[PDB]
Amino acid sequence: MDEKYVNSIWDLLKNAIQEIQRKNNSGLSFEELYRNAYTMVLHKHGEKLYTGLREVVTEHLINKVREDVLNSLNNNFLQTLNQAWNDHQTAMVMIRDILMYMDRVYVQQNNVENVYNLGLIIFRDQVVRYGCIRDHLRQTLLDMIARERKGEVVDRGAIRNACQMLMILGLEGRSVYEEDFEAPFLEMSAEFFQMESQKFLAENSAS
Amino acid sequence: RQINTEYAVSLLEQLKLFYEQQLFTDIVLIVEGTEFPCHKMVLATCSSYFRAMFMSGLSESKQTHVHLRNVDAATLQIIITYAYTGNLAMNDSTVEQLYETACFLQVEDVLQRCREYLIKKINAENCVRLLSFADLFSCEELKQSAKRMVEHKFTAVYHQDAFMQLSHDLLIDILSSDNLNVEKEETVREAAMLWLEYNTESRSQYLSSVLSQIRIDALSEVTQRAWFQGLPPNDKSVVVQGLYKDMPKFFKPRLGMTKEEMMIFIEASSENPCSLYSSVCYSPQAEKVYKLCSPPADLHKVGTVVTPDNDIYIAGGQVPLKQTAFRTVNCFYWFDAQQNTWFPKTPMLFVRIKPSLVCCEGYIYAIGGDSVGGELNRRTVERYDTEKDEWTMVSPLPCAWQWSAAVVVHDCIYVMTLNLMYCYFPRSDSWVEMAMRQTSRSFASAAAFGDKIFYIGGLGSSVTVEIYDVNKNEWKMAANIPAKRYSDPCVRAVVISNSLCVFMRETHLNERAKYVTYQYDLELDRWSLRQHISERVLWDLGRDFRCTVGKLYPSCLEESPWKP
Known part of the structure; x- marks a missing residue:
């Protein structure tokens, strides 16, 4: 139809998406708005909704979770990380199911990744693989695992939650998580146990 | 991992009883005031929306x-019962809304079922409608099947009203395609012209693109x-703009003008x-032998017919059952040109x-053919409907005949046997007695040329020719074909180039078969040597081979590699 109709449809869809991102998702009528978004991807542009989804998701992530992680890098860093992750994951669940059943003809004709995969990829690109969050997370996990290995006990369920989160973030298998976690931890473990063996060969005997 | 089917069907039927007896309904579908008390989880088993x-x-x-909302009560109910009991009553009318609601709810299985039904249902009167439907809903397989069938029957008809209401991209894809079947390149030109003139200036911007897909042989002449x-x-x-625009786009002949008799x-x-x-196949013009599928x-013992629309059909035949072993099957097939x-x-x-x-009035008539029944009505004559895709019985032939041939003249079916002939009147579905031949001959073929029936050969065969006139209702002799003595010619009556020719293969004693065709002079009653088929291109064919008139594209077919 006319450009005014699709412009109004997009404006109201953007308003609804912003309201959802502001912790108002479950309590929001969405049937008519999603039918309007379907009319959008049906009229001319066959990826308007998909593009708008990607832009809205990445903007919301950069505004909310990128700032939150950097603001609390020392106070319950991993804890707040996991909490924001679970919030983003239920946003997924809801938004996921809907635009994922839309990624049915999008894997039959467009042959692209599903919106669950799109959300996982954008979260990986904008949070975990950030220029500052990645190194900070690596350093803190190495520090806490070294302190645990020293003899004193620390939290252990949180590390399992983080590793499961990274595995889910892999989204294909053990490609990203294996490298990112193992390799620095591989080097740290190798150095630590080399030093331990060097100390033990001199401080004890073969008995 | 196998699955027990007994409790499977018990599950399904008890589920049906619960759908009919409203008990476990926590969710109800409110559609245009119609209550649909159902489950969230049988709706799971069906749909991928919920x-x-x-x-x-x-x-x-x-x-x-x-x-x-935006659904239909009947379509929703049939999808629900499809989920609950397992009966998908697919008719010939509600399939459109069925596909609409299946795409709405993203139900894969019913989508596949209705896609298969639409693939089976594609025909002339709904070709453009189904192509528009497959453009509206992404159904790429059905879209391609449509595109092809639509191309053919649209070039055939090009008068359906649904063509006017089509998207620009679909028209561009249809016209620019190299699969159009047209005797001339001017009919597509006038079709595009009438499509452009169908509406207001909204077609002006698409006119700069539709002419960019048509050849330039008409972009400087009339219709500018x-x-x-x-x-x-x-x-x-x-x-x-159009004055200086038709320089590019590489004029090239299409593929539809490549049909030869x-x-x-x-x-x-x-x-x-x-x-x-x-x-x-033999090429009377290219003088080559092109192979066919x-x-x-390997359906043997079949019959061939070519409609005036130049379509090839195969009916009857037997397949070797899984040493002599053969079982007869009533399968029907259509050849893609x-x-x-x-x-x-x-x-x-x-x-x-x-x-x-035999084709007549758009119906394919199969007369006799050694039916399996063998009852008192041992003819089992039945016609085929090309618009509804179904078979309807016709008036039985009064006398049972074996090894018979049939032709169509003057919108009537003329079946011929050893000595008798009966004409079928399709308008009243009755048989009338015709003239009686004076010679007892069988195992022959006849070709319908104009308003006369030419029964050539009969019994190997011979050179006996009996010409029958429909307007005169009499059998008369004309001449005998001059052939080499002490031979067994295999005559084949055929009509080609608006003339009655014969495909006669003769074999001499201790000699190989020779292929030669003759042109029969209608007014002079003489067979003239039209062309001699050299053995360097055509090899032996056998004895139970059939011949028919038709047009084929040498480009799509491939030459058969075989030594002379």
Whole structure:
């Protein structure tokens, strides 16, 4: 139809998406708005909704979770990380199911990744693989695992939650998580146990 | 991992009883005031939408009442019963809305079922409608099947009203395609012109693109000033634009103008001994032998017919059962003139062996053919409907005949036997006695040329010719074909180039078969040597081979590699 109709449809869809991102998702009528978004991807542009989804998701992530992680890098860093992750994951669940059943003809004709995969990829690109969050997370996990290995006990369920989160973030298998976690931890473990063996060969005997 | 089917069906039928007896209804579909008390989880087993509706955590997940809109009550009910009991009563009318609601709810299984039904249902009167439907809903397989069938029957008809209401991209894809079947390149030009003139200036911007897909042989001649007459007033951005625009886009002839009158042969002698028989064709103009696809599942003992619309059909035949072993099947097939393959169609009611396929009034008539019944009505004559894709019985032939031939003259069916002849009147469905032949001959073929029936040969065969006139209702002798003595010619009556020719293969004593065709002079009653088929291109075909009139594309077909 006319450009005014699709412009109004997009404006109201953007308003609804912003309201959802502001912790108002479950309590929001969405049937008519999603039918309007379907009319959008049906009229001319066959990826308007998909593009708008990607832009809205990445903007919301950069505004909310990128700032939150950097603001609390020392106070319950991993804890707040996991909490924001679970919030983003239920946003997924809801938004996921809907635009994922839309990624049915999008894997039959467009042959692209599903919106669950799109959300996982954008979260990986904008949070975990950030220029500052990645190194900070690596350093803190190495520090806490070294302190645990020293003899004193620390939290252990949180590390399992983080590793499961990274595995889910892999989204294909053990490609990203294996490298990112193992390799620095591989080097740290190798150095630590080399030093331990060097100390033990001199401080004890073969008995 | 196998699955127990007994408790499977017990599950399904008890589920049906619960759907009919409303007990376990926590969710109800509110559609245009119609209550649909059902489950969230049988709707799971069917649909892939309600996972967004239920397993999400939205307002609709908690809502025990959902107002489903933009759907139909009948379509929703049939989808629901499809989910609950397992009966998908697919008719010929509600399939459109069925596909609409299946795409709405993203139900894969019913989508596949209705897609298969639409693939089976594609025909002339709904070709453009189904192509528009497959453009509206992404159904790429059905879209391609449509595109092809639409191309063919639209070039055939080009008068359906649904063509006017089509998207620009679909028209561009249709016209720019190299699969159009047209005797001339001017009919597509006028079709495009009438499509452009169908509406207001909304077609002006698409006119710069539709002409970019048509050849330039018509982009400088007539039908350029006609658009200028229909041009919006004072528009100086189109006339001058089209004045200097038709320089590029590489004029090239299309593929539809590559149909030649060729002799299609079936059940020819297979070159490789691994196969029983094969299908070949002779080119009266190219003087070559192009190969054809094998009959479906090596369907032997079949019959051929070519409609005035130049369509090839196969009916009857037998397949070797899984040493002599053969079982007769009533399967029906249609030959694709471009894809070089046999598309299956609706099978007959009774199996046939060597059936006489005759086309008349758009109906395919199969007369006799050694039916399996053998009851008092041992004819089992039945016609085929090309618009409804179904078979309807006709008036039985009064006398049972064996090894018979049939032709169509003056919109009537003329079946011929050893000495008797009966004419079928399709308008009243009755048989009338015709003239009686004075010679007892069988195992022959006849060709319908004009308003006369030419029964050539009969019994090997001979050179006896008896000409029958429909307006005169009498059998008369004309002459005998001059052939070499002490031979066994294999005569084949055929009509080609608006003349009655014969495909006669003769074999001498201790000599190989020789191929030669003759042109019979209608007014002089003499067979003249039209062309001699050299043995360097055509090899032996056999004895049970058939010949028919038709047009084929040398480009789509491939030359048969075989030594002279």
